[PDB]
Design a protein around this motif. Structure first.
Motif: not given
Ligand code: CA
Length: 69
Positions: A26-47
């Motif tokens: 999240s703290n990378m410049i340009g990365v806005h929304q971040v969600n991590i699903n612990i069950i399925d391992g999916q990392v959704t990112v808007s950047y």
């Protein structure tokens, strides 16, 4: 301009791991929304530039996880 990706990780197992990776990505410049699903391992990112998929993925790898490409 804003990109959205779902990154399919493996290896993330604890809430602490999730928290740390969420913050780091999240703290990378340009990365806005971040969600991590612990069950399925999916990392959704808007950047946007200067963030890019490769640099987000590198952080995943640097923390010790893997990605399905
Ligand atoms: Ca394990």
């Amino acid at each position: 301009m804003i990109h959205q990706n779902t990154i399919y990780t493996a290896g993330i197992e604890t809430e602490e791991q999730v928290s740390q990776l969420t913050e780091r990505i999240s703290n990378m410049i340009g990365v806005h929304q971040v969600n991590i699903n612990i069950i399925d391992g999916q990392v959704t990112v808007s950047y946007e530039t200067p963030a890019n998929l490769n640099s987000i993925e590198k952080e995943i790898y640097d923390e010790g996880y893997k990605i399905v490409f």
